[PDB]
RNA sequence: AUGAGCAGGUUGAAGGUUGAGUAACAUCAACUGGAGGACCGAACCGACUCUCGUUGAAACGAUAGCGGAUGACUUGUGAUU
RNA sequence: UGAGUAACGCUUGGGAGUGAGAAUCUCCCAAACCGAUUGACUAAGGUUUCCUGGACCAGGGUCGUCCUUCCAGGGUUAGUCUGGACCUAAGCUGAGGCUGAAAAGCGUAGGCGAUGGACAACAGGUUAAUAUUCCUGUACUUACAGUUAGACUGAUGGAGUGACAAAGAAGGUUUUCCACCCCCAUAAUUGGAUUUGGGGAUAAAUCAUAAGGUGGUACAAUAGGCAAAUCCGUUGUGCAUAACAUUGAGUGAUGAUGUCGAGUGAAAGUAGCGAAGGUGGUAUUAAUCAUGCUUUCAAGAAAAGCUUCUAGGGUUAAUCUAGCUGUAACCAGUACCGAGAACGAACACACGUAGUCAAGGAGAGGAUCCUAAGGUUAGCGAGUGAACUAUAGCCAAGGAACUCUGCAAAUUAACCCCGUAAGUUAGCGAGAAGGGGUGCUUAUGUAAAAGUAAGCCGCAGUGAAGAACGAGGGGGGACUGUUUAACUAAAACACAACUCUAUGCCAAACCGUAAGGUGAUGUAUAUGGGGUGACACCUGCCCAGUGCUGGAAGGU
């Protein structure tokens, strides 16, 4: 049928991308909190 | 003139009557011009971000508004004809393309009896009363055809500009000023005795009586259909709930945002435009 | 219960058999389950038992019984059994073939017999 | 160019038949911090010559020791194609 | 907002041309027209039903039919709440 | 523990080899069907899963000598293709700014952003690759500069163009098919005979030729598109009726002494060789003409781009074009799978989906069955014919007696020819009902045909597969359609339309607080809300109260 989840590279990209969150200062300040949790996925590109 | 034939269904019924637009027109082909076009699209009731202004929009075809023009000053007096009256699909009524002598080609709403070929000019001065002429109110005498009416000097046209609809000169006022107007919508005010006014009544007399027969047709006209407002949750429209149709309990039945509209005083009455009031629907003033 | 393997059928015996009496007839000594020859010793026999007329009609009538090998083809089979094989099993009044027993298969256990001719 | 954008030649089998070709099709890997014409002019540059043609592929970060101990991924290095002219050669 | 697509068979409409016809209408004949929240009927859509599955591949399924299937049509893409 | 319980997640045979070891690996040949799909192009994605060799710690619902498993190594090539360097659509941001405690929302210029616009090569070949990407040939374009020659053009601005629906129809167009020939091959025992299979084409690019198509074309003056006009707008004369601006299928020759070809086919079906390389009708077929044309209304983008206008000017030249030559064509992609075991779905999942094309036989047609091409072994099997359990095939006899029930099943079904009732708001009713026939051969038959006559056969003649079981009565709902993803899909919802009310521009209203926006780029024949809810006639008493509206005195 019709899945929940698509494997939409671009589309993710554009809405959880870096830039996405970077033009937001929420985003930049949950990417502080993702810094404090010293994760390995950070964004797309360090993910 | 609206014609109803049986449609072959073999599913129910219906009653679309429709307009000949051959006989009353030429040829029945949309005839497009680069010159004047401005397109519109369905806005979907919806605000600046995405939420929602205006209820059940959408549907309706895809149209390019053709560019009319109502300034009726960048060119004046001089000689000019109408070249062809034709429908507006974004207006209720029918518009014509005329041609200023210098060979300047533009769109008006046409006023009901009119021909083509006849020459028609607009000027700022006394000249014909004839239907679709452009007069300052100065100059105008009582109980004349008027329609498309603008309330500012030169603020375009706004009363009287749906199909059969117009206005009639109750003379102008005893101290010389605010030209006073028995109003569409049985009202009663006094415009700016030099407002630019077009005489004439809007085509399309007969648009009451088109018959849109099928909801689908309704909604290809950009309507969307939408469940009453008993049958809703308490929520969201306060009228809505109960089990079992239950129905309205209450004088005066609320809207979805939950106030009164029968008859009650809903108006702003604190306008300017009430301080120059006749008859509103009402007592005098 | 949907969509799933037909398993056996008779129409799927009827074509297993065929193709075991094509395969025996293209080599003569098979090493096959019991099971299928203990089935297929009827249709041998009444083959080997037919085909002595030695006839035309016995040409078209085990025609319907071979199939195309790689190892021989379909009508010099015809010619050599009529010719030579066929006739050579008048001696004994039936047990015309042996299957005997071998061991087991090693994936799921089914009982290997080696099924050769001689009169 | 710069010239720092060649890092190395490959050489098998197929660059055997490759280099055998007409054509004198030589395959390197580079850096690729060049276009085309840029990779072009660096190798016009370490020795003088022009070449013929100048193709270019990449291969992206592919696991490297597939799954292991320590397991990771490969670099992405540029393969670039390049053909001498039809007559020229070098021995190097 | 931008695109793409929905076999075929049907039935045969509004309208219109000519003529009969009437003083003129009116009425009808021949002819074209090829539309119908028209019909089937495909793909396809959805799931009305009989049954099965009942830690099933199945977190909505298996066949058989079934209501449609050129419109109140679907979809693809992005966006928007 | 439950315990070997249930299961092995849509399916094979034989022989042989390797291998110590074989249902599971493969070599040969079998079988099975799909075949509008089990094809191919493939889009997206996963991105190495793709390949060679080695073994298969782990896993393969068993198996494992093997696998998308691992180990080592390796594979993806674009002057013309897609999208970049071109463009805008929805939409988004947005300095100097409205604007909100801060933080922020809004939006101008600007700047992004396809789902669309515009753009120069074909066939064949290769190897473990993959390739219009690399190459054989024939090409083509773009600029770059030089050169010569013609030699006034024309934006940044205006104008034309780009720049337009769905739907129907019949023309043309080449195909296709068939009649038919050529060539390759063909020569048959089991009864009878010399018979059947396949092929026959050749591109991009060039020109010649474009059947035709669209739709006005020379002159005069112009009242105007910020400014600027000769371009356009613009009224007449004139050619009108066709000159003309434009354009286009198709045909032929180069391409091509080539590819390819029925095929032949050595140490591999490979190295090599390679005939026919066609005629006429065509009631089928199909796509270029075609951005054609038309019917209708619910009337169907801009930007880039191309040219022009004056501009801007230069004219000891610029610019454009022509030729020639040199030069060059930069960014990422080109593997593989790819409606599924490489996407996800928890998965070797019997599960679901992007586009495109998709043969022969009958068939209206993608219905139907079997085959062409392609492709195949659905990761457990074997013995057996107990109960029980799924599926079928069968059932005589009654023919709804069972049930809460005609639930289930069943007669029904394709074609041809009829005929069809009352009622109808004149559309329907209505596959109405109900019936007749469908086979073969010999002829009549037209062009195949539809049909007709004579003879013959069956136990019946879509002799297989694909096809409605009705009629009437009552209730609501008119109705085609949407709905509780996921227990019950309707007499619920929606509803055309009716009725009433409210709403006149900085409209009311709505969102927001404002800002701002929709409303709306609307304008009382417009919109909202509140009741009804195919069609017809009505909607009877009551304003007590209140609701809403109104008012003027007055008590407050």
Same mark, same amino acid.
């Given at each position: 049928?019709?899945?929940?989840?698509?494997?939409?590279?671009?589309?993710?990209?554009?809405?959880?991308?870096?830039?996405?969150?970077?033009?937001?200062?929420?985003?930049?300040?949950?990417?502080?909190?993702?810094?404090?949790?010293?994760?390995?996925?950070?964004?797309?590109?360090?993910? | 003139?609206?014609?109803?034939?049986?449609?072959?269904?073999?599913?129910?019924?219906?009653?679309?009557?429709?307009?000949?637009?051959?006989?009353?027109?030429?040829?029945?082909?949309?005839?497009?011009?680069?010159?004047?076009?401005?397109?519109?699209?369905?806005?979907?009731?919806?605000?600046?971000?995405?939420?929602?202004?205006?209820?059940?929009?959408?549907?309706?075809?895809?149209?390019?508004?053709?560019?009319?023009?109502?300034?009726?000053?960048?060119?004046?007096?001089?000689?000019?004809?109408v070249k062809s009256i034709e429908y507006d699909p974004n207006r209720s009524c029918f518009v014509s393309l005329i041609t200023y002598a210098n060979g300047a080609k533009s769109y008006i709403i046409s006023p009901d009896g009119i021909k083509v070929g006849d020459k028609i000019l607009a000027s700022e001065h006394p000249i014909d009363i004839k239907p679709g002429f452009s007069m300052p109110l100065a100059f105008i005498p009582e109980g004349?055809?008027?329609?498309?009416?603008?309330?500012?000097?030169?603020?375009?046209?706004?009363?009287?500009?749906?199909?059969?609809?117009?206005?009639?000169?109750?003379?102008?006022?005893?101290?010389?000023?605010?030209?006073?107007?028995?109003?569409?919508?049985?009202?009663?005010?006094?415009?700016?005795?030099?407002?630019?006014?077009?005489?004439?009544?809007?085509?399309?007399?007969?648009?009451?009586?088109?018959?849109?027969?099928?909801?689908?047709?309704?909604?290809?006209?950009?309507?969307?259909?939408?469940?009453?407002?008993?049958?809703?949750?308490?929520?969201?429209?306060?009228?809505?709930?109960?089990?079992?149709?239950?129905?309205?309990?209450?004088?005066?039945?609320?809207?979805?945002?939950?106030?009164?509209?029968?008859?009650?005083?809903?108006?702003?009455?604190?306008?300017?435009?009430?301080?120059?009031?006749?008859?509103?629907?009402?007592?005098?003033? | 219960?949907?969509?799933?393997?037909?398993?056996?059928?008779?129409?799927?015996?009827?074509?297993?058999?065929?193709?075991?009496?094509?395969?025996?007839?293209?080599?003569? !000594?098979?090493?096959?389950?019991?099971? +299928?020859?203990?089935?297929?010793?009827? $249709?041998?026999? &009444? @083959?080997?038992?037919?085909?002595?007329?030695?006839?035309?009609?016995?040409?078209?009538?085990?025609?319907?019984?071979?199939?195309?090998?790689?190892?021989?083809?379909?009508?010099?089979?015809?010619?050599?059994?009529?010719? !030579?094989?066929?006739?050579?099993?008048? +001696?004994?009044?039936?047990?015309?073939? $042996?299957?005997? &027993? @071998?061991?087991?298969?090693?994936?799921?256990?089914?009982?290997?017999?080696?099924?050769?001719?001689?009169? | 160019?710069?010239?720092?954008?060649?890092?190395?030649?490959?050489?098998?089998?197929?660059?055997?038949?490759?280099?055998?070709g007409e054509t004198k099709k030589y395959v390197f890997v580079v850096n690729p911090k060049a276009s085309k014409t840029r990779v072009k002019l660096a190798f016009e540059l370490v020795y003088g010559i022009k070449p013929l043609k100048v193709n270019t592929l990449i291969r992206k970060p592919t696991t490297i020791r597939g799954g292991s101990r320590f397991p990771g991924l490969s670099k992405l290095e540029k393969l670039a194609v390049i053909?001498?002219?039809?007559?020229?050669?070098?021995?190097?």
């Amino acid at each position: 049928m019709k899945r929940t989840y698509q494997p939409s590279k671009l589309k993710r990209a554009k809405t959880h991308g870096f830039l996405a969150r970077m033009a937001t200062a929420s985003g930049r300040k949950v990417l502080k909190l993702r810094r404090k949790k010293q994760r390995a996925q950070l964004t797309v590109s360090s993910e | 003139p609206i014609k109803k034939i049986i449609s072959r269904s073999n599913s129910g019924i219906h009653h679309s009557t429709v307009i000949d637009y051959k006989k009353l027109l030429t040829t029945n082909k949309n005839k497009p011009e680069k010159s004047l076009l401005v397109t519109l699209k369905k806005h979907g009731g919806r605000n600046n971000q995405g939420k929602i202004t205006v209820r059940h929009q959408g549907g309706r075809n895809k149209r390019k508004y053709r560019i009319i023009d109502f300034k009726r000053t960048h060119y004046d007096n001089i000689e000019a004809t109408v070249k062809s009256i034709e429908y507006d699909p974004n207006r209720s009524c029918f518009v014509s393309l005329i041609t200023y002598a210098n060979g300047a080609k533009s769109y008006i709403i046409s006023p009901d009896g009119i021909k083509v070929g006849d020459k028609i000019l607009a000027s700022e001065h006394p000249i014909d009363i004839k239907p679709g002429f452009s007069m300052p109110l100065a100059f105008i005498p009582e109980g004349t055809q008027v329609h498309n009416i603008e309330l500012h000097p030169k603020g375009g046209g706004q009363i009287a500009r749906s199909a059969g609809s117009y206005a009639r000169i109750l003379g102008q006022d005893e101290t010389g000023k605010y030209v006073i107007l028995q109003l569409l919508s049985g009202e009663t005010r006094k415009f700016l005795k030099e407002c630019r006014a077009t005489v004439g009544v809007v085509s399309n007399l007969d648009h009451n009586l088109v018959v849109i027969g099928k909801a689908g047709r309704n909604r290809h006209r950009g309507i969307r259909p939408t469940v009453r407002g008993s049958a809703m949750n308490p929520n969201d429209h306060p009228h809505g709930g109960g089990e079992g149709r239950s129905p309205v309990g209450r004088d005066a039945p609320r809207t979805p945002w939950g106030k009164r509209h029968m008859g009650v005083k809903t108006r702003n009455m604190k306008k300017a435009s009430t301080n120059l009031i006749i008859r509103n629907r009402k007592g005098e003033q | 219960s949907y969509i799933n393997k037909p398993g056996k059928t008779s129409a799927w015996r009827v074509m297993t058999v065929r193709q075991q009496v094509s395969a025996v007839l293209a080599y003569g !000594k098979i090493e096959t389950t019991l099971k +299928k020859a203990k089935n297929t010793q009827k $249709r041998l026999d &009444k @083959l080997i038992t037919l085909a002595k007329v030695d006839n035309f009609n016995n040409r078209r009538q085990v025609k319907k019984w071979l199939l195309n090998t790689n190892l021989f083809d379909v009508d010099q089979l015809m010619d050599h059994l009529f010719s !030579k094989v066929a006739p050579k099993y008048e +001696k004994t009044p039936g047990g015309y073939s $042996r299957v005997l &027993k @071998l061991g087991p298969r090693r994936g799921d256990a089914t009982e290997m017999a080696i099924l050769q001719l001689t009169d | 160019d710069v010239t720092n954008v060649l890092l190395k030649p490959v050489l098998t089998e197929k660059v055997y038949f490759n280099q055998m070709g007409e054509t004198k099709k030589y395959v390197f890997v580079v850096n690729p911090k060049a276009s085309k014409t840029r990779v072009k002019l660096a190798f016009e540059l370490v020795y003088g010559i022009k070449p013929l043609k100048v193709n270019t592929l990449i291969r992206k970060p592919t696991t490297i020791r597939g799954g292991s101990r320590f397991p990771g991924l490969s670099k992405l290095e540029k393969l670039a194609v390049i053909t001498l002219p039809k007559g020229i050669a070098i021995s190097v």
